[PDB]
């Protein structure tokens, strides 16, 4: 019982790999209650070869997705590889391992899917495994930072909402974009840009933060940078340039159910980067105080950040405070807060996380994000402000 | 002093 | 030619009115090229005390506008009164002084008018007065630290704009309000709120500094404090309060005509203030630059700001640069510098100055910003989208 | 320094 929880992994790369940089190091430090124990890759030759690197002893090397959803060894599996896979992916890993029943939880990434009904589906399948835990991986939702700030609100330290303010950054759909980056991450149809994932990920530690989510919303949508320009390795630029065609801004503002308190947010899609302001802030104007968070990566869900408070201690006397936690690894710590989340419940079926402090996260929330996405997405089409108070239900 | 997350940074982790 | 524009003045309260302590001063420093010749107010009473107490050496005083609309002696005529008598006023000197010829001029402030259709009007009527140059107050326009942030863009020190980011405060439709204030700025009808006037004033400068106008744009409008707090003349609150109409905060989105440049903005109505943060400010990220505008009042229009600029000097060497101007009266220097914009042109018709760096604004932006603001609010309402490439029209 | 306007300011003008 008191007794690992073995890990099967999907999107194992090696070991320089982006899980291997993050969850890997995740369930080190949960060595005690997580082992790796699968690791599917389509070669066998690299299943073997990153459990040489990593020493992962435990671990026994997959060649077939069918062959990997069966291992009757695994309770959790993760997959985290790309999201246009990501529907191929799960699905079958649902329908090849309904005989394993010690699989208790499927981890997996923000984007849960690459479309909404795309993933609508592997929801509405998730539901079925009465025996299943989904978990998508907002870490967003863990941050020192945005918890902090949560619970300042929460608390009444400022108050009442008044008006909540916004900027981000995409990275790579800048005036810039680098050599390594893959060009599906840029492909329209890719079902990844700026909104859809880096937004996504912030407006919901938002709605995560205040713990409202939304009644009605507008936006809108800019492809002004058709062609960038390609970066040398050392980010030096190049002559050389290249095609987009996931948009450079999205402009977007929507009334919160929750006192029907506004929002404003301009998110922008890279470089050149502001310098005049912090790429990545979330100004909220509370009613007896200010809470500012500031990062100048607008990876929150990957970034150390800062933030500033101000207003009363409790919740007349107000106070200043300034929370930043100099090294924290959040690139990795983050997630492994989310481990922890899991080893709790588990060492110690959940629905969404939704507005609460303990647990994680599930394809119900990342569905909800998801759902609400598409409102984006249908609203700048649509060019018209639509109501986004269902989003949070279903059947 | 507070070291904040550089997308400088971030492009080499990803 | 060569002497004094005369202006005729309605809304000269006293020596202790708004225009007195704005506009007169403005025509004080061109003593040389304007002479106040005529105030009208209801009560005789008023105007000759203001003539005597400000020694308005050529002033002569008028109990009737008609009466006043008549005076063959004034060649521009100010309209500095509240705006919802803005309709009625205006229309009225307009109709009367047909016969009057000198009478070259017609200034007026923002709002224009009340309402588009009211507005609407005024210009209609401005029209026919081939001789009539016409002026809505938009000081904005004026402001050192607009116009250097619009010279640095044009010579493209930015590059190309990506995007622009805004904030606010109406300042009294906050969780507080002043004993002063007037009812109407709360009560709904007036035409009198955040949005047409605030709000209006700022994201013209910006059409203005950015100088492109909009395309389609998105506004919500909030009504979340329905009851404020009464202000004891020193600031402090008391324990007394009065519900209001007019809305508290607007959100709103848009994307600018020249480059599908995108545009956010968030503007408070009043208190508290943001404390984090500046309560005035504009953020536009350019392509090799950056430029940013702050004030901690939201009345930009009058107030004394600062910029912070950075990028290539002329337009791959970025450069900073903060343009702040140390005790500048943008109360007073602002309105000023609209009235030399008049004695330049007239020691030296218009449409409007739109774009323009020189010149001032004219009722036909008057109107446009006007046109523009019924979109914002058939927006909200309507719950849609709208294209306002139109207004320009 | 930055002489800027404050609203405190304003509203006594104003």
């Known amino acids: 019982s008191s007794r690992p929880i073995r890990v099967g992994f999907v999107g194992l790369t090696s070991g ?3 899980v291997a940089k993050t969850h890997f190091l995740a369930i080190q430090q949960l060595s005690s209650q997580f082992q790796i124990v699968a690791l599917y890759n389509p070669t066998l030759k690299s299943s073997l070869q990153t459990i040489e690197q990593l020493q992962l002893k435990h671990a026994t090397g997959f060649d077939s997705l069918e062959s990997f959803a069966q291992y009757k060894d695994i309770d959790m599996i993760v997959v985290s590889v790309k999201v246009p896979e990501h ?9 090849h391992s309904s005989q394993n029943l010690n699989l208790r939880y499927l981890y997996v990434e923000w984007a849960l899917a690459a479309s909404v009904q795309q993933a609508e589906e592997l929801y509405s399948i998730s539901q079925q495994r009465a025996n299943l835990q989904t978990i998508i991986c907002l870490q967003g939702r863990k941050s020192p930072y945005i918890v902090r700030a949560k619970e300042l609100i929460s608390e009444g330290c400022i108050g009442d909402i008044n008006s909540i303010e916004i900027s981000g950054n995409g990275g790579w759909y800048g005036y810039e974009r ?13 079902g990844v840009n700026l909104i ?7 407006i919901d530690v938002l709605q995560y933060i205040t713990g409202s989510y939304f009644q009605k919303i507008n936006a809108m949508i800019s492809n002004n940078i058709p062609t960038q320009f390609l970066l040398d390795e050392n980010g030096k630029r190049t002559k050389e340039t290249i095609s987009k065609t996931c948009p450079d801004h999205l402009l977007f503002q929507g009334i919160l159910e929750n006192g029907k308190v506004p929002v404003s947010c301009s998110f922008k899609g890279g470089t050149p980067v502001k310098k005049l302001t912090k790429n990545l802030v979330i100004d909220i104007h509370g009613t007896k105080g200010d809470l500012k ?6 990876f929150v869900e990957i970034s150390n950040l800062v933030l500033y408070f ?9 106070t200043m405070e300034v929370f930043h936690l100099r090294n924290y690894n959040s690139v990795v710590g983050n997630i492994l807060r989310i481990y922890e989340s899991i080893a709790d419940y588990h060492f110690l079926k959940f629905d969404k996380q939704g507005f609460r402090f303990e647990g994680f996260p599930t394809f119900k929330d990342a569905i909800i994000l998801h759902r609400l996405i598409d409102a984006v997405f249908r609203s700048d089409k649509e060019e018209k402000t639509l109501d986004v108070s269902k989003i949070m239900i279903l059947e | 002093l507070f070291n904040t997350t550089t997308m400088d940074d971030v492009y080499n982790y990803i």
């Open chain 1, 16 to 18: 320089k790999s982006w």
């Open chain 1, 87 to 95: 529907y191929e992916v799960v699905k079958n890993i649902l329908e």
């Open chain 1, 178 to 190: 680098p050599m390594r980056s893959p060009e599906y991450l840029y492909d329209i149809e890719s």
């Open chain 1, 196 to 202: 859809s994932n880096s937004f996504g990920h912030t």
């Open chain 1, 293 to 298: 968070i500031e990062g100048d990566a607008g």
């Open chain 1, 310 to 318: 101000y207003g009363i201690k409790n919740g007349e006397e107000q």
